[PDB]
Write a protein that binds this DNA or RNA. Structure first.
Length: 74
DNA sequence: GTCTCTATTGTCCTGG
DNA sequence: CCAGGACAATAGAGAC
Protein backbone atom coordinates (compact mmCIF):
# COMPACT_ATOMS: atom_id res chain seq x y z
CA UNK A 1 0.00 0.00 0.00
CA UNK A 2 1.52 3.37 -0.91
CA UNK A 3 1.14 6.47 1.33
CA UNK A 4 -1.33 9.16 0.11
CA UNK A 5 0.02 12.27 -1.57
CA UNK A 6 0.41 15.36 0.52
CA UNK A 7 -0.39 18.88 -0.71
CA UNK A 8 3.05 19.30 -2.22
CA UNK A 9 3.12 15.99 -3.92
CA UNK A 10 -0.31 16.76 -5.51
CA UNK A 11 0.81 20.15 -6.83
CA UNK A 12 4.26 18.86 -7.73
CA UNK A 13 2.68 15.91 -9.48
CA UNK A 14 1.52 18.19 -12.30
CA UNK A 15 3.93 21.15 -12.04
CA UNK A 16 6.96 18.90 -12.48
CA UNK A 17 5.48 17.61 -15.72
CA UNK A 18 4.88 21.26 -16.52
CA UNK A 19 8.37 22.37 -15.61
CA UNK A 20 9.83 19.39 -17.51
CA UNK A 21 8.06 20.52 -20.70
CA UNK A 22 9.16 24.14 -20.42
CA UNK A 23 12.59 22.78 -19.45
CA UNK A 24 13.40 19.33 -21.02
CA UNK A 25 16.98 20.42 -20.39
CA UNK A 26 16.93 20.54 -16.61
CA UNK A 27 17.66 17.47 -14.54
CA UNK A 28 14.99 16.23 -12.11
CA UNK A 29 16.90 17.18 -8.99
CA UNK A 30 16.73 20.74 -10.36
CA UNK A 31 13.06 20.41 -11.07
CA UNK A 32 12.78 19.44 -7.33
CA UNK A 33 14.74 22.50 -6.21
CA UNK A 34 12.45 24.76 -8.31
CA UNK A 35 9.21 23.16 -7.18
CA UNK A 36 10.47 23.66 -3.64
CA UNK A 37 11.28 27.31 -4.23
CA UNK A 38 7.98 28.22 -5.87
CA UNK A 39 5.89 26.24 -3.40
CA UNK A 40 7.22 28.53 -0.63
CA UNK A 41 6.38 31.51 -2.87
CA UNK A 42 2.83 30.15 -3.36
CA UNK A 43 0.52 31.91 -0.90
CA UNK A 44 -1.56 29.79 1.55
CA UNK A 45 -4.73 30.85 -0.27
CA UNK A 46 -2.98 29.78 -3.47
CA UNK A 47 -2.06 26.41 -1.97
CA UNK A 48 -5.62 25.82 -0.57
CA UNK A 49 -7.21 23.97 -3.55
CA UNK A 50 -4.35 21.53 -3.32
CA UNK A 51 -4.67 20.92 0.39
CA UNK A 52 -8.30 20.27 -0.44
CA UNK A 53 -7.29 17.79 -3.13
CA UNK A 54 -4.74 16.10 -0.84
CA UNK A 55 -7.69 15.56 1.60
CA UNK A 56 -10.10 14.07 -0.91
CA UNK A 57 -7.22 11.66 -1.54
CA UNK A 58 -6.58 11.00 2.17
CA UNK A 59 -10.26 10.36 2.71
CA UNK A 60 -10.50 8.16 -0.40
CA UNK A 61 -7.43 6.27 0.76
CA UNK A 62 -9.22 5.74 4.08
CA UNK A 63 -12.11 3.98 2.18
CA UNK A 64 -9.88 1.85 -0.05
CA UNK A 65 -7.77 0.64 2.87
CA UNK A 66 -9.28 0.62 6.39
CA UNK A 67 -6.58 -1.54 8.01
CA UNK A 68 -3.63 0.50 6.74
CA UNK A 69 -0.89 1.35 9.22
CA UNK A 70 1.93 3.43 7.73
CA UNK A 71 4.91 1.03 8.09
CA UNK A 72 8.43 2.44 7.45
CA UNK A 73 11.77 0.59 7.66
CA UNK A 74 15.44 0.82 8.77
C1' DG B 1 20.70 -2.61 -20.98
C1' DT B 2 19.17 -3.11 -15.62
C1' DC B 3 19.36 -1.22 -10.99
C1' DT B 4 20.31 3.12 -7.54
C1' DC B 5 20.26 8.10 -6.66
C1' DT B 6 18.47 12.42 -6.95
C1' DA B 7 16.08 16.19 -4.63
C1' DT B 8 11.62 18.50 -2.90
C1' DT B 9 7.41 19.29 1.27
C1' DG B 10 4.30 17.37 4.26
C1' DT B 11 2.80 13.80 7.50
C1' DC B 12 3.51 9.78 10.03
C1' DC B 13 6.33 6.76 13.20
C1' DT B 14 9.95 5.59 16.46
C1' DG B 15 14.77 5.51 18.78
C1' DG B 16 17.06 8.28 22.89
C1' DC C 1 8.09 14.76 23.85
C1' DC C 2 10.95 15.62 20.24
C1' DA C 3 14.54 15.65 16.68
C1' DG C 4 15.55 13.00 12.95
C1' DG C 5 14.25 9.79 9.59
C1' DA C 6 10.61 7.25 5.86
C1' DC C 7 8.22 7.66 1.92
C1' DA C 8 4.69 9.62 -1.01
C1' DA C 9 5.78 10.94 -7.77
C1' DT C 10 8.79 11.55 -10.66
C1' DA C 11 11.93 9.99 -15.12
C1' DG C 12 16.73 10.90 -16.77
C1' DA C 13 21.23 10.85 -15.54
C1' DG C 14 25.59 8.39 -13.80
C1' DA C 15 27.91 3.58 -12.65
C1' DC C 16 29.15 -0.62 -13.50
Amino acid sequence: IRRPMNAFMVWAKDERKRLAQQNPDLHNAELSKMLGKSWKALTLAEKRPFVEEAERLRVQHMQDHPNYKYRPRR
